[PDB]
Paper text:
Here we present the crystallographic structure of hUPP1 bound to 5-FU. The structure of hUPP1 bound to 5-FU provides further insight into this motion, having been crystallized in a transitional, intermediate position roughly 80% of the way from “open” to “closed”. Analysis of electron density distribution at the enzyme's active site reveals density in omit maps consistent with bound 5-FU. The fluorine moiety of 5-FU forms a hydrogen bond with Ser142 and is otherwise closely encased in a cluster of hydrophobic residues including Leu272, Leu273 and Ile281. Comparison of the architectures of BAU-bound and 5-FU bound monomers of hUPP1 reveals that substantial structural changes are restricted to a single loop region toward the back side of the active site. The 5-FU-bound structure shows that this conclusion is inaccurate, as the loop clearly closes around the small fluorine moiety of 5-FU. Specifically, in the BAU-bound structure of hUPP1, three partner-subunit residues assisted in the coordination, respectively, of the benzyl moiety (Tyr35), the ribose group (His36), and phosphate ion (Arg94). These chemical groups are all absent from the 5-FU-bound structure, eliminating every interdomain protein-ligand interaction. In spite of the lack of these stabilizing associations, all of these residues adopt conformations similar to those observed in the BAU-bound structure. Consistent with 5-FU not effectively stabilizing this interdomain conformation, the resulting structure is found partially open and the phosphate site unoccupied. Even a small obstruction that maintains the separation of Arg94 from Arg138 (as produced by crystal contacts in the 5-FU-bound structure) may effectively completely disrupt the enzyme's activity by preventing phosphate coordination and in turn, catalyzed phosphorolysis of uridine.
Uridine phosphorylase (UPP; EC 2.4.2.3) is a ubiquitous enzyme that catalyzes the reversible phosphorolysis of uridine and analogous compounds to uracil and ribose-1-phosphate, playing an important role in pyrimidine salvage and regulation of uridine homeostasis. Interest in understanding the activity of human uridine phosphorylase (hUPP) stems from its role in the activation of pyrimidine nucleoside analogues used in chemotherapy, such as 5-fluorouracil (5-FU) and its prodrug, capecitabine. Most interestingly, the hexameric, trimer-of-dimers organization of prokaryotic UPPs has been dissociated in favour of strictly dimeric complexes in eukaryotic organisms. One of the unexpected findings of the first structures of hUPP1 was the discovery that the domains of the enzymatic dimer are flexibly linked, allowing an interdomain motion from an “open” ligand-free conformation to a “closed” catalytically-active structure.
Author numbering:
A (entry chain B), B (entry chain A): 16 to 308
Write the structure that this text describes.
Amino acid sequence: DCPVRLLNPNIAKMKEDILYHFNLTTSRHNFPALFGDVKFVCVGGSPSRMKAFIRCVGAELGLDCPGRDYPNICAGTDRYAMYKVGPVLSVSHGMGIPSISIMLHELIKLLYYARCSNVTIIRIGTSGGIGLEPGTVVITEQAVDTCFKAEFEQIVLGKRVIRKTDLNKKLVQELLLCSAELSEFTTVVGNTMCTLDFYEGQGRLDGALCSYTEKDKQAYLEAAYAAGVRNIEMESSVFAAMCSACGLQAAVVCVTLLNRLEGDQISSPRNVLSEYQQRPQRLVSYFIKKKLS
Amino acid sequence: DCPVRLLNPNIAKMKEDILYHFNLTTSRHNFPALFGDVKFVCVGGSPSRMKAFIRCVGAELGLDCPGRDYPNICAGTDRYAMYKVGPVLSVSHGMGIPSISIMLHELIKLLYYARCSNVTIIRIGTSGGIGLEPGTVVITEQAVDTCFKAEFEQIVLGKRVIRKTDLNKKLVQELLLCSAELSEFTTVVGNTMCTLDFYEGQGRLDGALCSYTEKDKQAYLEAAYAAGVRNIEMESSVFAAMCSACGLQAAVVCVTLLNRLEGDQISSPRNVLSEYQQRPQRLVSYFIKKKLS
Ligand SMILES: O=c1[nH]cc(F)c(=O)[nH]1
Ligand SMILES: O=c1[nH]cc(F)c(=O)[nH]1
């Protein structure tokens, strides 16, 4: 019903397209036959988390056959990993705007060549909370910049280009509904601030560099909280400004690993942090199951 | 002689430090005993490229003993891989400014706790060339922004903070020296433009998004060429801005994978691309064997 579209008049004249970072080529691969049935894409930082995600949702849908694995569709490259089970695609994206950008440029063309339509895309990951207990799942209402505005800036040919961040409201609602049914963890809906640096960029005091005080930070965070911000991470803004523009329905679901009003160090036991990081997976695999039933 | 320093008062007050992304902590690890003897750090995108590097410099230094390999010091995470042979450290950094910044904050802190001094740090990578044949090695004179200036801008508590990019001039001459001795491939010195996006960020026409034309790309790449730029990549600017400020001598050495005046697609056969990628490694590992002879 709603096809994945590119916003680029230069693609039609190309004889082939090398998705360099995926190690996939329009000449070597039957894209419509490989990926044409994709309806749900889950993305996150880590290749192992994304394979775990693909195993878990394969089980949830019961396409989980005994023994056998989900091959890395991008095995051979080491930039991104990719997995698939029925209409679900799993894709790692590393850390930061540039890393997910490259993945998203290539994934969106991949889906376009595959002539995919009605695609829901969900980012799962981790974040720092503002005024939330650690381990809280935040469903992102708006992906915002460091002014707390629903905007994404990039430089194109030396000029600053402002594009809007848009996450699907209906999708936000569906995921919230799912979480109240599950009732396995605190879930909130808030704005998510995207940064280009984890230390000075997130107002941390424990970096190799720090140009400000404990109270400069505290007052920036409180300002953020007042403007609707509930968490902080590194990939939401570019994700929200590309997916919508290309006809994907996008959501972001992150767990908080700490409350940033109370500290900076991520000091919880490994096991606790591990339990926290299952939570976006749990919510999103359950949501996919509920949508495909 | 010259110690690795931090530009952060809050670090001495701290009782313990968790290097979250390395899975290293002061409370579990002996930093001087682990890393005190490190004099050279080589950084690059991929874990497997950085393992191949430690093996190569190991061989070069004659510390290549029969059979055994190099344990990943950061095993148990998948953010960054890290390897050591004698006084050389090898650390991967993934893709983009944010990925390498996180690595750099925690790496500099790691060198500090280890009481390291006289540390030379080199980035080896890949890049798109401007007016150079594919496979040319570029030693970066200045890491520049998208207006061709030796500055790195980040946002700190909502505010634009501009720092200078500084790459060691003597180090550039030393690397060039080694290249003239080796005489195994074309080596140029020039400026490197760091970008936040591989497609539109670098004036490519083949992204999922493109508002401009061939003529626009061409004029922007020419303007860059006239301002000293010979190659384009994604990590040099934050690298150049952080390393020197913290008392490390920094260099960037990238091979070009294509000539951007001629195209955007990376269509060289895989084996050709591999040969190209061994080149910065060849030069840097030889530089290191030379400094330690
Ligand atoms: O970008 C972030 N990711 C995860 C965190 F815990 C955090 O504080 N910031
Ligand atoms: O950032 C880049 N790395 C490698 C390339 F070939 C290129 O064009 N751009």
